[PDB]
Amino acid sequence: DRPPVTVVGLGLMGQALAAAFLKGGHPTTVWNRSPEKAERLVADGAVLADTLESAVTASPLVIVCVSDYDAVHELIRPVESALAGRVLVNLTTATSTQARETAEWAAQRNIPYLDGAIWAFPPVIGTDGAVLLYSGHKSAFEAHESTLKAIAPAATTYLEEDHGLSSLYDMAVLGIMWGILNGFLHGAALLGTAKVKAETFAPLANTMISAITEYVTAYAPQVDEGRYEATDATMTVHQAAMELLAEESEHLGIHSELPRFFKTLADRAVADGHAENSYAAMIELFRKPTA
Amino acid sequence: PPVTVVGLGLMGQALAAAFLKGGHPTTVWNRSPEKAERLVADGAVLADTLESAVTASPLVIVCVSDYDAVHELIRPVESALAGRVLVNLTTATSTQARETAEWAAQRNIPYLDGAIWAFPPVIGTDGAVLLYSGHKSAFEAHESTLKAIAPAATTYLEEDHGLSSLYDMAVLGIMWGILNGFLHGAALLGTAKVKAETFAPLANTMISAITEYVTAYAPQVDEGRYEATDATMTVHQAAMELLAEESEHLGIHSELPRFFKTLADRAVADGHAENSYAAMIELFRKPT
Ligand SMILES: NC(=O)c1ccc[n+]([C@@H]2O[C@H](COP(=O)([O-])OP(=O)(O)OC[C@H]3O[C@@H](n4cnc5c(N)ncnc54)[C@H](OP(=O)(O)O)[C@@H]3O)[C@@H](O)[C@H]2O)c1
């Protein structure tokens, strides 16, 4: 019942998890290269650890959330022994090919591994907001689902045994994720010029931001399918509009690099043919590599 | 009451219904006239020329390619327009809405800068949402009628036209920012023999999911310090590599993320490595 758990790496993200556990019964031991950065967790009742092995030792579940698989690897190895016998959940961010590669390493060292992908932000962690995708040893997944739920109680979730995907998806969403932050921060810079509090702006954004997810679902079909007979609008429209946006930004006296880029693609896609086609067609351009 | 609309673009046609399927009897016309049928079959009123079309309603709605087009229409019907009231929904900049605004008042033609946020289907539904800007007086008069098209959120700003349009711009960028990430993302899982059909749902999940946290930034921007909570630039920075690294590895267009990084790189270079992705804004204040 709320069993123990050990988490490694105390980034903004690192620390957020610990609480979910701590602030979910699960007694949590924690360890981090530089240390110091803890108090609140310890104050909130955590256990700082002598060394890594000590930290590992002290729990059946080992969560690792750090910079990069490079880091990960050069932790594990030193405790590789101690890990066998315990399940390793890697939430460090990494590519398909990285997840896949680290998956193998553990199995070859007889360590049950899970490659989890976080879709939540420090705050969100522990809430019905947060959502994770894990992939790996279904046995292990089933085995600790409970404790795992602590962080994404709404959607602690598992995909088949191939790790690649969990991570792959992770990438996909990222980028989408940035795609927004950008448009928004840009849009905001825009209304910035008009002495408009983002506080003001955002709401309506988010209003329209919710509005779009609609059309997206419709587009998927077009890609899944083929002909990009347009429903929304032609590329050529979108294309022009980007100019305007660019034109706007420039006029306003703020970075215009973003939209101008957006156009170049439109331009390409158009150049490539499908000017009449829905923005769907853009996909064909992404299927097409850039080096 | 009656209503008249101009332009049978993708957008043009969509609206008709909202009107038609909202009482408003609609006598419209089109640049490339020779289309309606289904509309006319669904029971429209097709006028002959522009003035004819203007004549035939107290409210007149124009949605065409671009303010360039718009402008070179007005004159011909400029007579018929006085008395009626036109709401420009042709896609156009602040400074274009501004110019259209001026010209109108200077000919006592009542104008509104209106911003459509919906997709053909969505039009007329509690989904659709419109942002207008113009004369308080005018708003009251057809608020109810106006609601017909965006029954959830037919909505009005200060008197400035610029803004309605401005906002419009702000979003579309956001809007593209998505379509891209998605289409790219989709190409990504493409490689893994993954139907977009499959992918999209979760996209849309995350598509809804983020707008939340974004708002948490607004204060930081409105404020100053970008003390990070979420994640430092430097994190995002690394992640973008991976994404880029991913795409490349997988054998698909990589130019996009490679860009993302450069900015990250800049922002970092420009100090705020520790700061939330918020800080990126400061790079937008810096012109191209
Ligand atoms: N922040 C978020 O919102 C968020 C969301 C989803 C996913 N993530 C993922 O979570 C991970 C970290 O995010 P974060 O913001 O918590 O990162 P962070 O603030 O940079 O923390 C990462 C941790 O990695 C440790 N570390 C890794 N390799 C090390 C090494 N070789 N030597 C010493 N310390 C090492 C760092 O310890 P020292 O620096 O003290 O040595 C630090 O505690 C990343 O993989 C990221 O993709 C973050």
DSSP A23-63: TTS--EEEE-SS--TTTHHHHTT-EE-SSHHHHHHS-SEEE
Q: Are B84 and B29 a contacting pair, CB within 8 Å? A: no
Measured CA to CA in angstroms, residue A155 lies from A120, A126, B94, B204 at distances of 11, 10, 43, 15
Q: Are A57 and A38 a contacting pair, CB within 8 Å? A: no
Count the helices and strands in chain A (H runs, E runs).
11, 9
Q: Which CATH architecture has domain B195-284?
A: Orthogonal Bundle (1.10)
Q: Are B112 and B138 a contacting pair, CB within 8 Å? A: yes
B219 and A240 within 8 Å at the Cβ level: the answer is no
Q: What is d(CA A10, CA A25) in angstroms, rounded to the nearest whole number?
A: 19
Q: Which residue has the tokens 């795992």?
A: A148
Q: Answer yes or no: is A24 a known binding residue.
A: no
Q: Which CATH architecture has domain A5-160?
A: 3-Layer(aba) Sandwich (3.40)
* A197-287 classified as CATH 1.10.340.30: no
Residues of A in contact with B200 (CB under 8 A): 216-217, 219-220
State which approach was used to obtain the coordinates: X-ray
Region of B34 please: left (phi>0), alpha (psi -120 to 50) or beta.
left
Contacts of A38 (CB under 8 A, 6+ apart): A10, A30, A32, A46, A48
Contacts for B104-111: CB closer than 8 Å, 24+ residues apart: B107/B78, B107/B81, B107/B82, B108/B82, B109/B78, B109/B81, B109/B82, B109/B85, B110/B85, B110/B86, B110/B134, B110/B135, B110/B138, B111/B85, B111/B86, B111/B87, B111/B161
Q: Tell how far the Cα of A8 is from the centroid of ligand 1, in angstroms.
A: 9
Residues of A in contact with B91 (CB under 8 A): 237, 241, 244
Helix, strand, coil % in chain A, rounded to nearest 5: 55, 10, 30
Residue B26 CA to chain centroid, in angstroms? 24
Residues of A in contact with B13 (CB under 8 A): none
Side chain identity at B166, as an amino acid letter? L
Q: To probe the interface with B, which of A128, A231, A257, A279 has the most B CB atoms within 10 Å?
A: A257
B29 bridge partner residues: B6
Region of B7 please: left (phi>0), alpha (psi -120 to 50) or beta.
left
- For residue B286 the two structure tokens come to 């810096």
Question: How many Å is the Cα radius of gyration of chain A?
Answer: 23
Q: What is d(CA A63, CA A65) in angstroms, rounded to the nearest whole number?
A: 7
Q: What is d(CA B287, CA B281) in angstroms, rounded to the nearest whole number?
A: 11
Strand pairing category for B111-117 and B129-134:
antiparallel
Q: Domains of chain B: which residue ranges? A: 4-159, 195-284
A85 to chain B, closest Cα gap in Å: 31
Contacts of B271 (CB under 8 A, 6+ apart): none
Measured CA to CA in angstroms, residue B50 lies from B5, B57, B60, B74, B81 at distances of 10, 12, 11, 9, 10
CATH of domain B4-159: 3.40.50.720
Q: What is d(CA A256, CA A186) in angstroms, rounded to the nearest whole number?
A: 9
Q: Are A265 and A290 a contacting pair, CB within 8 Å? A: no
Domain A5-160 and domain A197-287 have a common topology = no
Contacts of A39 (CB under 8 A, 6+ apart): none
Measured CA to CA in angstroms, residue A62 lies from A42, A67, A91, A111, A135 at distances of 18, 16, 11, 11, 15
B171 and A187 within 8 Å at the Cβ level: the answer is yes
Q: Which regions of chain A does DSSP assign to beta strands (E)?
A: 5-8, 28-31, 47-48, 61-64, 87-90, 113-115, 117-119, 131-135, 155-159
- For residue A91 the two structure tokens come to 């939430």
Using CA coordinates, name the residue in chain B closest to A209.
B211
